Motif scaffolding. Structure first.
Motif, PDB file in Angstrom:
ATOM      1  N   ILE A   1       0.770  -1.249   0.000  1.00 48.68           N
ATOM      2  CA  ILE A   1       0.000   0.000   0.000  1.00 48.68           C
ATOM      3  C   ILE A   1       0.814   1.320   0.000  1.00 48.68           C
ATOM      4  O   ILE A   1       0.804   2.057  -0.988  1.00 48.68           O
ATOM      5  CB  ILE A   1      -1.098   0.014   1.103  1.00 48.68           C
ATOM      6  N   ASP A   2       1.508   1.642   1.089  1.00 46.77           N
ATOM      7  CA  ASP A   2       2.172   2.954   1.131  1.00 46.77           C
ATOM      8  C   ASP A   2       3.107   3.177  -0.072  1.00 46.77           C
ATOM      9  O   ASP A   2       3.540   4.295  -0.352  1.00 46.77           O
ATOM     10  CB  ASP A   2       2.880   3.226   2.477  1.00 46.77           C
ATOM     11  N   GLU A   3       3.390   2.099  -0.788  1.00 44.23           N
ATOM     12  CA  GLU A   3       4.322   2.123  -1.915  1.00 44.23           C
ATOM     13  C   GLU A   3       3.558   2.369  -3.215  1.00 44.23           C
ATOM     14  O   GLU A   3       3.818   3.338  -3.928  1.00 44.23           O
ATOM     15  CB  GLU A   3       5.048   0.782  -1.990  1.00 44.23           C
ATOM     16  N   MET A   4       2.621   1.461  -3.503  1.00 45.68           N
ATOM     17  CA  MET A   4       1.629   1.589  -4.569  1.00 45.68           C
ATOM     18  C   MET A   4       0.993   2.972  -4.620  1.00 45.68           C
ATOM     19  O   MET A   4       0.672   3.476  -5.689  1.00 45.68           O
ATOM     20  CB  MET A   4       0.535   0.531  -4.390  1.00 45.68           C
ATOM     21  N   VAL A   5       0.814   3.581  -3.457  1.00 44.40           N
ATOM     22  CA  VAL A   5       0.167   4.877  -3.374  1.00 44.40           C
ATOM     23  C   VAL A   5       1.002   5.971  -4.047  1.00 44.40           C
ATOM     24  O   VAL A   5       0.459   6.795  -4.792  1.00 44.40           O
ATOM     25  CB  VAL A   5      -0.211   5.220  -1.909  1.00 44.40           C
ATOM     26  N   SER A   6       2.312   5.979  -3.819  1.00 37.95           N
ATOM     27  CA  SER A   6       3.153   7.028  -4.418  1.00 37.95           C
ATOM     28  C   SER A   6       3.710   6.672  -5.816  1.00 37.95           C
ATOM     29  O   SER A   6       4.172   7.557  -6.545  1.00 37.95           O
ATOM     30  CB  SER A   6       4.264   7.520  -3.459  1.00 37.95           C
ATOM     31  N   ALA A   7       3.635   5.393  -6.189  1.00 39.57           N
ATOM     32  CA  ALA A   7       4.074   4.941  -7.518  1.00 39.57           C
ATOM     33  C   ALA A   7       2.997   4.905  -8.625  1.00 39.57           C
ATOM     34  O   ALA A   7       3.247   5.340  -9.737  1.00 39.57           O
ATOM     35  CB  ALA A   7       4.763   3.585  -7.415  1.00 39.57           C
ATOM     36  N   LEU A   8       1.811   4.386  -8.329  1.00 44.50           N
ATOM     37  CA  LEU A   8       0.801   4.209  -9.364  1.00 44.50           C
ATOM     38  C   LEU A   8       0.049   5.489  -9.672  1.00 44.50           C
ATOM     39  O   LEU A   8      -0.291   6.254  -8.773  1.00 44.50           O
ATOM     40  CB  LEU A   8      -0.182   3.104  -8.975  1.00 44.50           C
ATOM     41  N   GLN A   9      -0.226   5.711 -10.953  1.00 43.80           N
ATOM     42  CA  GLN A   9      -0.965   6.891 -11.365  1.00 43.80           C
ATOM     43  C   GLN A   9      -2.131   6.562 -12.290  1.00 43.80           C
ATOM     44  O   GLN A   9      -2.085   6.848 -13.476  1.00 43.80           O
ATOM     45  CB  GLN A   9      -0.030   7.888 -12.029  1.00 43.80           C
ATOM     46  N   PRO A  10      -3.195   5.974 -11.734  1.00 45.08           N
ATOM     47  CA  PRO A  10      -4.393   5.606 -12.491  1.00 45.08           C
ATOM     48  C   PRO A  10      -5.029   6.775 -13.241  1.00 45.08           C
ATOM     49  O   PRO A  10      -5.003   7.913 -12.782  1.00 45.08           O
ATOM     50  CB  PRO A  10      -5.353   5.142 -11.406  1.00 45.08           C
ATOM     51  N   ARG A  11      -5.606   6.466 -14.396  1.00 41.54           N
ATOM     52  CA  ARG A  11      -6.332   7.428 -15.212  1.00 41.54           C
ATOM     53  C   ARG A  11      -7.702   6.806 -15.386  1.00 41.54           C
ATOM     54  O   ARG A  11      -7.801   5.589 -15.575  1.00 41.54           O
ATOM     55  CB  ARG A  11      -5.608   7.620 -16.559  1.00 41.54           C
ATOM     56  N   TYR A  12      -8.752   7.622 -15.285  1.00 41.74           N
ATOM     57  CA  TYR A  12     -10.126   7.104 -15.183  1.00 41.74           C
ATOM     58  C   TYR A  12     -11.026   7.587 -16.343  1.00 41.74           C
ATOM     59  O   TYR A  12     -11.186   8.796 -16.582  1.00 41.74           O
ATOM     60  CB  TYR A  12     -10.790   7.475 -13.822  1.00 41.74           C
ATOM     61  N   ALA A  13     -11.644   6.633 -17.028  1.00 46.73           N
ATOM     62  CA  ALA A  13     -12.568   6.955 -18.087  1.00 46.73           C
ATOM     63  C   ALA A  13     -13.789   6.035 -18.085  1.00 46.73           C
ATOM     64  O   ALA A  13     -13.707   4.883 -17.655  1.00 46.73           O
ATOM     65  CB  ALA A  13     -11.853   6.890 -19.413  1.00 46.73           C
ATOM     66  N   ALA A  14     -14.912   6.541 -18.586  1.00 47.75           N
ATOM     67  CA  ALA A  14     -16.123   5.736 -18.750  1.00 47.75           C
ATOM     68  C   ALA A  14     -16.808   5.826 -20.136  1.00 47.75           C
ATOM     69  O   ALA A  14     -16.504   6.682 -20.969  1.00 47.75           O
ATOM     70  CB  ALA A  14     -17.105   6.085 -17.669  1.00 47.75           C
ATOM     71  N   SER A  15     -17.750   4.921 -20.365  1.00 49.76           N
ATOM     72  CA  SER A  15     -18.603   4.957 -21.550  1.00 49.76           C
ATOM     73  C   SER A  15     -19.965   4.409 -21.145  1.00 49.76           C
ATOM     74  O   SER A  15     -20.062   3.576 -20.245  1.00 49.76           O
ATOM     75  CB  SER A  15     -18.013   4.079 -22.653  1.00 49.76           C
ATOM     76  N   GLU A  16     -21.022   4.888 -21.777  1.00 44.74           N
ATOM     77  CA  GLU A  16     -22.309   4.230 -21.625  1.00 44.74           C
ATOM     78  C   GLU A  16     -22.707   3.530 -22.923  1.00 44.74           C
ATOM     79  O   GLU A  16     -22.698   4.129 -23.983  1.00 44.74           O
ATOM     80  CB  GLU A  16     -23.386   5.214 -21.165  1.00 44.74           C
ATOM     81  N   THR A  17     -23.034   2.251 -22.829  1.00 47.59           N
ATOM     82  CA  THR A  17     -23.579   1.498 -23.956  1.00 47.59           C
ATOM     83  C   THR A  17     -25.055   1.085 -23.751  1.00 47.59           C
ATOM     84  O   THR A  17     -25.452   0.584 -22.680  1.00 47.59           O
ATOM     85  CB  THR A  17     -22.780   0.223 -24.171  1.00 47.59           C
ATOM     86  N   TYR A  18     -25.865   1.285 -24.789  1.00 50.66           N
ATOM     87  CA  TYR A  18     -27.278   0.903 -24.741  1.00 50.66           C
ATOM     88  C   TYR A  18     -27.664   0.026 -25.919  1.00 50.66           C
ATOM     89  O   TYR A  18     -26.973  -0.008 -26.933  1.00 50.66           O
ATOM     90  CB  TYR A  18     -28.187   2.133 -24.662  1.00 50.66           C
ATOM     91  N   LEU A  19     -28.775  -0.684 -25.775  1.00 57.50           N
ATOM     92  CA  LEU A  19     -29.223  -1.607 -26.805  1.00 57.50           C
ATOM     93  C   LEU A  19     -30.131  -0.928 -27.826  1.00 57.50           C
ATOM     94  O   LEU A  19     -31.026  -0.152 -27.462  1.00 57.50           O
ATOM     95  CB  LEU A  19     -29.932  -2.795 -26.162  1.00 57.50           C
ATOM     96  N   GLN A  20     -29.897  -1.227 -29.102  1.00 54.61           N
ATOM     97  CA  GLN A  20     -30.687  -0.651 -30.183  1.00 54.61           C
ATOM     98  C   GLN A  20     -32.000  -1.421 -30.359  1.00 54.61           C
ATOM     99  O   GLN A  20     -32.124  -2.553 -29.887  1.00 54.61           O
ATOM    100  CB  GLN A  20     -29.870  -0.660 -31.476  1.00 54.61           C
ATOM    101  N   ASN A  21     -32.976  -0.795 -31.020  1.00 53.99           N
ATOM    102  CA  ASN A  21     -34.245  -1.445 -31.381  1.00 53.99           C
ATOM    103  C   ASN A  21     -35.291  -0.461 -31.902  1.00 53.99           C
ATOM    104  O   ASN A  21     -35.268   0.723 -31.564  1.00 53.99           O
ATOM    105  CB  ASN A  21     -34.824  -2.244 -30.209  1.00 53.99           C
TER     106      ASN A  21
END
Lengths: 350, 14
Positions: free
Chosen positions: A330-350
């Motif tokens: 933990i205390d290590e991962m915290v200062s090393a990792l740099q996550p980037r966050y993205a989303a998408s919404e998918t819906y069904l056609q009809n």
């Protein structure tokens, strides 16, 4: 190859993507094989000027590689079993439809929406095995929602991992790790139950080679790739990368604006009684040693007010390099990792 | 709080 006009898988997939993956013409029968090709796509470690970088390695021996620069110019190279090295630059607006069809995160003034080509959960898992290959919009950082800010960052990795493994879709270097096999992996890390953390041996030297090998033996991929995998696991950083990947709080920046619609959905659903979310993860080690994690959590969501009674899937992406020299701590991962966050919404056609 | 809206799939269900 047994016919001049017979295309490698790599080539088949590429043509479909630029032509448009949602082009109406498709025969349904074509749509099925097209998805079966799209899933071989894997996001990998990008380079200085790349938004993201995709790589697919097929069974027929073909390879598709694609780079998207920050300015959004695409470069695709296709290799084949007979050593042809096809290359194509999309620098005008030719990459127009192609960008929607890749494991990439784009700067976009609103949230990206896709379409499919959803009752039970087998259904729900497949829908994410699809959207995890489509594009996502980037979510700008905010201190109130970065899981990595605040009090106890990464506190749940081992718990999240323990209960995630056996239930996820998971790829290591494009080799699928099935449920049985994941369970061996979980054991191999020292995760017996909800409250154990990993044996210090694993923390310092990755999985043992003996486990690393059996795990590969039990998975799905080419011999060359299984060997890539075994070497990956015998590395401290595989531990960091695998466990970090399962960190549920990665969904928080995504859930911040969507949580109300996610509720309407379990509600709207509860009047039919069920799970809500699933996991899909790709981890890759570049031939130059670089580890990249792309982490996906698919989630049932109600569409906005304008389309009532429609339920789709929010697809959250979390992306990061795991720099050589970062143990699962933990205390290590915290200062090393740099996550980037993205989303998408998918819906069904009809 | 917000993660409380998620209900993860589990293999162990018929």
């Amino acid at each position: 190859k047994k016919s001049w006009d017979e295309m490698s898988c790599a080539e088949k997939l590429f043509k479909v993507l630029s032509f448009g993956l949602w082009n109406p013409t498709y025969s349904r029968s074509e749509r099925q094989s097209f998805q079966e090709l799209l899933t071989v796509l894997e996001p990998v470690y990008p380079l200085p000027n790349e938004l993201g970088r995709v790589s697919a390695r097929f069974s027929d021996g073909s390879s598709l590689r694609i780079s998207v620069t920050n300015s959004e110019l695409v470069e695709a190279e296709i290799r084949t079993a007979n050593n042809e090295k096809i290359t194509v630059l999309l620098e005008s607006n030719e990459q127009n439809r192609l960008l929607q069809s890749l494991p990439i995160d784009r700067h976009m003034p609103y949230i990206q929406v896709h379409r499919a080509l959803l009752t039970d959960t087998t259904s729900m898992r497949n829908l994410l095995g699809f959207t995890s290959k489509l594009s996502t919009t980037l979510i700008p950082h905010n201190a109130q929602t970065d899981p990595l800010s605040g009090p106890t960052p990464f506190s749940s990795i081992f718990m999240d991992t323990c209960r995630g493994l056996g239930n996820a879709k998971l790829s290591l270097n494009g080799v699928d790790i099935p449920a049985n096999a994941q369970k061996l992996l979980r054991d191999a890390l020292g995760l017996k139950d909800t409250h154990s953390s990993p044996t210090r041996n694993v923390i310092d030297h990755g999985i043992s080679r003996h486990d690393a090998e059996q795990i590969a033996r039990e998975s799905s991929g080419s011999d060359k790739q299984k060997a890539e995998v075994v070497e990956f696991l015998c590395h401290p950083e595989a531990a960091t990368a695998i466990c970090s990947a399962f960190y549920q709080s990665f969904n928080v920046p995504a859930l911040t604006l969507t949580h109300e619609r996610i509720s309407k959905a379990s509600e709207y659903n509860a009047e039919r009684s069920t799970p809500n979310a699933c996991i899909n993860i790709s981890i890759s080690q570049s031939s130059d040693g670089n580890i990249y994690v792309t982490s996906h959590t698919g989630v049932l969501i109600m569409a906005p007010e304008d389309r009532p009674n429609e339920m789709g899937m929010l697809t959250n992406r979390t992306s990061y390099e795991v720099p050589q020299g970062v143990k699962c701590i933990i205390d290590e991962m915290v200062s090393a990792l740099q996550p980037r966050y993205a989303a998408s919404e998918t819906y069904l056609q009809n | 709080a917000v993660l409380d809206v998620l209900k993860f799939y589990d293999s162990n269900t018929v």
